[PDB]
Design a protein. Structure first.
Lengths: 238, 53, 216, 216, 216, 119, 53, 53
């Protein structure tokens, strides 16, 4: 759900009010009239954060994007603070489709192993980077380049795939998940990391997209897909 | 029909009519197969209500 | 209790066999899974005389001497009377001996099976007040769900047995994987064996080879 | 009930064997599936004396002493009389003993089998009012559907058994897969064994080794 | 004690099968592990008449003469009375004999099973003060947890048995590894065999073939 | 090239807008013949993409017919049962319909040498 | 319309109404071609009955 | 519902009831599609009229 769809200013539901199709089309399911205004905007975080299409930094600290007014936004920052802002872009790497030389046999996928290089992301901010007497504890031990990405797996030539969203881990501290003395995510601090992502699905053809639509950086060094072969029992999507 | 209520008096003139509920059988969604049985059932319910009225 | 819905059971079977979750029976995978789940429910119903299938009912409709009981697996006993007066059992006779006597209205003494879902009782009742006085000890068929939001008329603690059977059939059909089918079948057979050995229709203290028929 | 259609059963078999459901028997796989479903229906009918096949009927037509019962699997008993007077069972004799006596009109005493679908009764009835007094205890054939919208004259709770048998035969014919055929055959045999063990034509209390033949 | 939580058991099963521990049932492997843990808990409950499942309770609610016990695996004995006066055990009768007598209010003498989770007692109590004097010796169903922070109502010294069974089913479903499933099943079966051989509801000194039924 | 549909701005001379809207600009459908034993009397499956019009129990809601055309990449499994020492495929068309075959695969089993001839 | 019956009394008011029959025009069979004419006819039958009521 | 009309006498009991119009949602003159929106709209109009009656 990367779209913000409004009908005369009323927000529509991604699956109840419209349908996101595979051909660059939006299909309206509800009742509407002629002459109404349908606006489709890019909202990578869904209907919950419509301002998620751009990122704002205040003193090298990522902030929640405020609602722009007439192409302009305001911040409640202290005078003299350095502000960096820009527009997010969509980054996608697509693997070749794997069919095991068979167009009819099912392949049940079990796991995807992703080998990531994090040497560009293992750097942290130091106390000498403090500007205008900001909160030093918010900046220190903070990763200069955050590392995180999304993994989508699609089957049977269809684009309605299963997505694992944050595979590097949370960017904040969670109970029973975070570790002491290591900044979150703690999988980023390892210069070379191997992620085992369980992707359970059945199809004659499977394909992976490693994507991102935020200020986060990834560097895939390799991948491997584990699968088992079943019978030729494919019938269709409907 | 089976009565399971309180004991009625002797020779109670019990009357049963038909009253088709005003409700939809099923909502068709995106990608749903066109069901001839569903169409016939909806038309039959409409006919039943009209005959009752 | 009975709180598991048809869509949830289909989703459970799909995750157990290795497929993605579904939201409706709009695609072929969920359609085949729904058919397989209905077949598994029927098979589990045929597997045993379950307590949630055994009941005492009255006849749905009556022809002169034939009472129609609808769709039931089998008829065990027939009784006449009321709860405030007691129930007297009718004697079962085969069709040839049943047809050897005159069929006349009265109070039922013998009964037999006629075609599918019908019991012929002689003498037969002619009024509704007499027809409603006959109790049929039957084993019901499992009610099959039809849509996503249908609640399965089966206790929640046999849903795993139904899931094992449906997963065996889905491994046969959708995957064509004999090893997975055999593994799920082994799970189902072990579960069914334990359930049938532990849940019987009588108590251990009441399980006896002596039944007091009568002294005539 | 009997609400399953021939096209629905064919589509179920096609989905189970891995083919797309059809709307008519227009392609070779649909035609083969229809023929296989008819064969499986006949096979299931031959598998057991089902309650939906056992019935008591009268003869379709009469030649002088030969009553034609059409196409029935077997004839179990023959009776003479009416419901208001009772039915007396006729004694079966072999063809040579039957032919040893004079064939004259009268009230039936013995009967035998003549060729296919025919029962010879001696003495034989000559009028329709006497012909309609003869009851034949036969096992019917399964009615085979002919077109897509034909309703199968079989209760819906045996449709899955018919599907298992049809899937076995379709794995033999279409898929040419012995392992899948064996899996479907195992399913069919297990369910058929349970059905034959549980659904019999007499009750457990009526199952006895003693039958009363009256003091001739 | 009973201090193990559903999220901890799911994390243990995931770590044993080779998956990373989770903090919530948000992804597919955690959801499948939770469902497998519930199924394994039900399986362990059905594997034996555990001491943490055997108990004496009163009926949840009463219809005129039928007491509803909710969802229990089996009903062993029924008793009438109080602890300050003693309990007298009722005699079990089958449904046909139970229905042969008049159903009137009074003090319970016989009982039978009706449908699912119900006991019919004759004579039956009509007031709550009389209803609360009936003790049912039942085997409870295992309480299945619903969310992450739910505490499993099972002692922590059977969590390893539950984990072995859940790991067997998870090797069947997730890993598709027959050898791993067999190893986990061997562990589970050996553990359960020792537990059932060592944990019985009577002592060795009390294990006797003689029971005193008093000189009727 | 065939997943494109007509929009309401393509209406000309006040025509029936509903007949034009959600109509595929480029229809996609073809015929598949399988030819055996070097003989030209092959077996043909005529419309493999499906019907170009709505059929009960075959068409889907909110998707224009054929609904197999609306998928950008589609795999069709056509069952072709026949016996022959040599088999061949013809993907053909004789209408205003367009196709783009990206690949194909044939599944077959071997049987032992019992061919006699056409007559 | 035409009339063929008994002679009516003096300037009797005859007032003709419309009464759409409560019946299905076609029972849609399985796998049948969709008929826009049949769809419109059924909807028009319902609308006519509603308008008369 | 706003009221912009003439002057209303004091304490006037205004009653509002629902009355579904007797009209077609849209005529089906096409054979390449059938929208679940149209299907549900026709069924809902029928049900609404039935409930109001």
């Amino acid at each position: 759900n990367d779209l913000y769809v409004t009908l005369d200013g009323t927000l529509l539901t991604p699956n109840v009010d419209y349908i996101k199709e595979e051909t660059g089309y939006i299909y309206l399911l509800s009742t509407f009239s002629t002459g109404q205004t349908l606006k489709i905007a890019s909202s990578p975080e869904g209907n919950t954060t419509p301002n998620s299409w751009y990122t704002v930094y205040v003193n090298n600290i990522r902030q929640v994007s405020p609602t722009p007014s007439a192409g302009t936004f305001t911040l409640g920052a202290t005078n003299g603070d350095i502000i960096n802002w820009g527009v997010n872009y969509l980054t996608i790497y697509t693997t070749p489709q794997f069919l095991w030389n068979s167009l009819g046999n099912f392949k049940r996928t079990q796991h995807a192993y992703l080998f990531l290089d994090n040497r560009d992301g293992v750097g942290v901010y130091v106390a000498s980077d403090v500007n205008n007497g900001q909160d030093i504890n918010q900046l220190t031990e903070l990763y200069r380049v955050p590392i995180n990405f999304n993994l989508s797996v699609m089957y049977n030539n269809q684009l309605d795939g299963s997505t694992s969203y944050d595979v590097m881990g949370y960017d904040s501290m969670y109970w029973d998940e975070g570790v002491f003395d290591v900044s979150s995510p703690y999988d980023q601090y390892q210069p070379y990391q191997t992620l085992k992502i369980p992707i359970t699905g059945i199809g004659y053809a499977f394909q992976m997209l490693i994507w991102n639509h935020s200020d986060e950086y990834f560097k895939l060094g390799g991948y491997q897909i584990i699968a088992k072969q079943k019978g030729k029992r494919h019938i269709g999507r409907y | 029909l089976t009565y399971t209520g309180a004991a009625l008096p002797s020779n109670t003139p019990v009357e049963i009519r038909r009253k088709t509920p005003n409700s939809i059988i099923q909502l068709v969604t995106y990608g749903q197969k066109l069901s001839s049985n569903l169409w016939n059932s909806e038309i039959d319910r409409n006919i039943r209500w009209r005959e009752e009225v | 209790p009975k709180t598991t819905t048809f869509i949830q059971l289909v989703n459970k079977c799909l995750e157990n066999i290795g497929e993605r979750p579904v939201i409706s029976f709009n695609n072929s995978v969920a359609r085949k899974a729904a058919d397989t789940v209905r077949d598994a429910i029927t098979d589990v119903s045929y597997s045993y005389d379950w307590s949630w299938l055994t009941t005492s009912i009255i006849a749905n409709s009556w022809i002169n001497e034939r009472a129609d009981l609808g769709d039931v697996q089998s008829v065990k006993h027939v009784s006449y009377g009321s709860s405030s007066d007691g129930y007297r059992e009718l004697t079962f006779t085969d069709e040839r001996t049943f047809d050897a006597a005159k069929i006349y209205p009265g109070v039922g003494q013998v009964f037999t099976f006629n075609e599918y879902g019908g019991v012929r009782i002689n003498p037969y009742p002619e009024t509704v007040e007499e027809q409603v006085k006959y109790k049929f000890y039957v084993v019901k068929e499992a009610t099959l769900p039809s849509v996503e939001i249908d609640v399965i008329n089966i206790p929640d603690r046999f849903i795993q047995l139904i899931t094992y059977n449906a997963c065996t059939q889905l491994s046969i059909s959708h995957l064509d994987d004999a090893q997975a089918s055999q593994m799920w079948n082994s799970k189902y057979i072990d579960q069914l064996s334990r359930l049938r050995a532990r849940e019987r229709n009588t108590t251990q203290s009441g399980a006896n080879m002596f039944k007091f028929r009568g002294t005539r």
